[PDB]
Structures are given as structure tokens and as C-alpha cells.
């Protein structure tokens, strides 16, 4: 589902808009987005609280794969 | 290298003590700890800035594996 950095940002914005802080995002994120990997959701959590460049997080995710 | 939650906390404390913020931790962490996976380092980054329970992050890492 994360084919480009834009997808990381889109899903991240969506989950945070629900009111999910980082812990709740890591608990609810996987239920709402079962197609994402745990590393995907950790990267989204980092984007959502620290506003790290989605390009950087995307590149890190590519390495892990 | 992360066989228990204690290892996540130990390495996290070590990297943050060097002055590494989250972005620099994700850039320098892999160089300093080449034995860790990218998901390992993302979990350590989450612990170091948000103080999420290392037990929770450890359990998430087990799932990914």
C-alpha cells in the first residue's frame, strides 16, 4: 500500500486525524490497515509525531525490504 | 542483538546519550549498530523520543519477524 512516500504521508495524516497518539496508532493502525507491515506502521508513527521527511522514511522502508 | 526488551532500552539510551535526535539516530544508528535491522532502529527511535514501553515495542518487533 506504500508504493511512494505520498502514501506514507496520506495514511499517517488519516490515522492521526482520528485522534490516535503514537501508542494508540501502533495498536489501532494494524487493525485498520491490515495490509501494512509493522515497519510500515512504525515509519508512519515517526512521521506523525516528529514530522520526519516522508522521503527519508520511505527510503528506510525500502532498505528493510 | 535485541533478544529482550532490555536490549532495546539499553541501545536506545546509548544512542540518545550521544546527542542524536530522531533523524540523526536513524542515520547514525545503522552505522554504529550494523547488527540491528531497520525495524529495530525505528523501534529504538520511538522509545527514545516518546518513551513507549519497551515491552510493547519488543512485542511489535517479534510480530514483524
Numbering used by the authors:
A (entry chain A), B (entry chain A): 1 to 65
Sentences from the paper on this structure:
Starting from only a choice of chain length L and oligomer valency N (2 for a dimer, 3 for a trimer, etc.), the method carries out a Monte Carlo search in sequence space starting from a random sequence. The loss function guiding the search is computed by inputting N copies of the sequence into the AlphaFold2 (AF2) network, and combining structure prediction confidence metrics (pLDDT; per-residue structural accuracy, and pTM; an estimate of the TM-score) with a measure of cyclic symmetry (the standard deviation of the distances between the center of mass of adjacent protomers within the predicted structure). To eliminate such over-fitting, we generated new sequences for the HAL backbones using the recently developed ProteinMPNN sequence design neural network (accompanying manuscript: Dauparas et al.).
To evaluate design accuracy we attempted crystallization of 19 designs and succeeded in solving crystal structures for seven (three C2s, two C3s and two C4s). All crystal structures had the correct oligomerization state and closely matched the design models (median Cα RMSD of 0.6 Å across all designs, with resolutions ranging from 1.8 to 3.4 Å). The side chain conformations in the crystal structures also closely match those of the design models. HALC2_068 is a fully helical dimer with an extensive interface formed by 6 interacting helices (3 from each protomer), with a single perpendicular helix buttressing the interfacial helices. Despite the low secondary structure complexity and absence of long-range contacts, this design also differs significantly from its closest structural relative in the PDB (TM-score: 0.57).
